[PDB]
């Protein structure tokens, strides 16, 4: 739940060049600092797949620095569906907003009834200090029948963690399945 | 959001400001009345007369007349003679009127 | 042979172009009377030495130099600074 990844500085070098040279341009900022950076693409990839916005990534800077960062945002090539830039948000002692992976557990009554659990939110935005960033946030989705749902206003919350959205943000629900016989009255429509 | 107070103010003030003359503005508190003369080009008061500053008293209307008269004295001295009357949110009547009437025979051209 | 039951067109017209717009710009020298802006409504407002005609036309009242101004919520204004 704490990852490393080597980073490097950059100035004039054109992003285009850097990309077709297998690196990935980025940036590194918080209220106090802001620095153009780049990482190895293939190296970022393997890390980011696991870490995501959810877990802290530590940037090994050339000047021997080791910075705690969250990935704040990631810019995609629309055509290619492939990363073209990264934002690294350097953590400070301060509390920070962030997305924490929800973990639904227990197979819902509705899923058994033949429905399907639509996982509306997969992470939830939260105020929390770095030293105490949680991860798996369990959710009993088991009592959920078809036509029911639960909201943010129904979450575990480890201590020292703020429901940083509307409480009424609907978290997940259970929806009736696709069904071939529905096509009948869809034809009768 | 706006009070009818404010709406009147803008409405009568803007019209006068367009004529480009000097502006005789007026404030009419429950206890006093004040009148300053303004160059809206530069945004500056050229001369001012008031009840509080005059250390004056003796029935509001009769008082008001004098502050006008006094206003003209200091005005004409400076060179001011041509002027336009900002009657503010107040109906041209009574106290405000008296200020005008005084400032008139006091020498101001308006 | 060819020319079969075709159709018609229930519309297909327009009005004449009205040549609206700003006619003199910031920094342009102008004679009193010069048309400064042709417009519909006050897309611009008359400022210093600028009058407005019945169809919202903005013209100079003095010989001078045209000057523009955006006063935010109070609208945009065309002025004419006279020249000494």
């Amino acid at each position: 739940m704490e990852y490393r990844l080597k980073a490097y500085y950059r100035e004039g070098e054109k992003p285009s060049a850097l990309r077709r040279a297998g690196k990935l341009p980025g940036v590194m900022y918080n209220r106090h600092l802001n620095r153009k950076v780049y990482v190895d693409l293939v190296e970022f990839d393997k890390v980011f797949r696991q870490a995501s916005i959810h877990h802290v990534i530590v940037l090994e800077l050339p000047d021997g620095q080791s910075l705690p960062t969250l990935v704040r945002q990631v810019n995609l090539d629309k055509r290619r569906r492939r990363p073209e830039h990264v934002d690294f948000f350097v953590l400070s002692d301060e509390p920070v907003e962030m997305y924490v992976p929800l973990r639904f557990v227990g197979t819902p009554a509705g899923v058994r009834a033949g429905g399907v659990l639509q996982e509306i939110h997969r992470d939830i935005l939260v105020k929390v200090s770095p030293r105490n960033i949680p991860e798996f946030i369990e959710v009993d989705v088991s009592g959920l029948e078809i036509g029911d749902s639960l909201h943010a206003s129904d979450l575990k919350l480890p201590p020292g963690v703020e429901l940083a959205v509307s409480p009424e943000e609907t978290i997940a629900a259970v929806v009736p399945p696709e069904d071939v016989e529905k096509l009948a009255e869809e034809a009768a429509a | 959001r706006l009070t009818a107070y404010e709406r009147r103010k803008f409405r009568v003030r803007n019209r006068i400001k367009r004529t480009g003359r000097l502006r005789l503005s007026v404030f009419r508190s429950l206890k006093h009345i004040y009148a300053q003369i303004i160059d809206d080009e530069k945004g500056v008061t050229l001369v001012s007369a008031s009840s509080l500053a005059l250390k004056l008293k003796g029935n509001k209307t009769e008082v008001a007349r004098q502050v006008g008269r006094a206003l003209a004295e200091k005005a004409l001295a400076l060179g001011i003679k041509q002027v336009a009357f900002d009657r503010g949110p107040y109906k041209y009547h009574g106290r405000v009127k008296a200020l005008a009437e005084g400032a008139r025979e006091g020498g101001l051209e308006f | 042979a060819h020319k079969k039951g075709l159709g018609s067109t229930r519309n297909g017209r327009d009005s004449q172009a009205k040549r609206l717009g700003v006619k003199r710009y910031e920094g342009q020298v102008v004679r009193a009377g010069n048309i400064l802006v042709r417009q519909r409504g006050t897309r611009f407002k008359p400022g210093k030495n600028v009058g407005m005609g019945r169809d919202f036309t903005l013209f100079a009242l003095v010989d001078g130099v045209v000057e523009f101004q955006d006063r935010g919520r109070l609208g945009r204004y065309v002025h004419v600074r006279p020249l000494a």
């Binding site: 980011f48 797949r49 696991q50 870490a51 995501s52 916005i53 990935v71 945002q73 990631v74 995609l76 629309k78 055509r79 290619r80 569906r81 990363p83 997305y99 899923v111 033949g114 399907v116 659990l117 639509q118 996982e119 997969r122 992470d123 929806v175 399945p177 696709e178 069904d179 071939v180 016989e181 529905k182 096509l183 | - | 060819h2 020319k3 079969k4 039951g5 075709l6 159709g7 018609s8 067109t9």
Partner: protein, 141 residues
């Protein structure tokens, strides 16, 4: 059959199809999606056709998402008539799709099940397509 309930205007100019997709480029609902590789006017017939194909494939089960909608009126002048004398009539609606646009999504159906179903769907579409899995990249968007 998709089409607007109501319409501000009945006929609509054709337009070009410049650039990559404007947005709707990341998976947002299910686990797998179908992505447009080349641009096209996707007919309301095709949308529906793909939809049915998936439905049918995993008979009763899973949920299908449809991230495209035909709001563009498609015109056609009658057969064997000449140019001019007005614009043709509306004869259907299309959805303008561009490369990168995820068009369908599925969920709550096994990985193998999703793969075949989305695959069949693409066969109905007039363009080249690719299937994709929900990524860390998608959830980041």
């Amino acid at each position: 059959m998709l089409m607007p309930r109501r319409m501000k205007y009945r006929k609509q100019q054709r337009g070009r199809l410049k650039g990559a997709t404007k947005g709707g480029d990341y998976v947002a609902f299910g686990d797998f999606g179908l992505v447009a590789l080349e641009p096209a006017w996707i007919t309301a017939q095709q949308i529906e056709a793909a939809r049915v194909a998936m439905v049918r494939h995993f008979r009763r089960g899973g949920k299908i998402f449809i991230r495209i909608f035909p709001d563009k009126p498609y015109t056609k002048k009658p057969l064997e008539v000449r140019m001019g004398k007005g614009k043709g009539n509306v004869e259907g609606y299309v959805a303008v799709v561009k490369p990168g646009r995820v068009m369908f999504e599925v969920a709550g159906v096994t990985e193998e099940q999703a793969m075949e179903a989305l695959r069949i769907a693409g066969h109905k579409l007039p363009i080249k397509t690719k299937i994709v899995r929900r990524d860390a990249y998608d959830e980041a968007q």
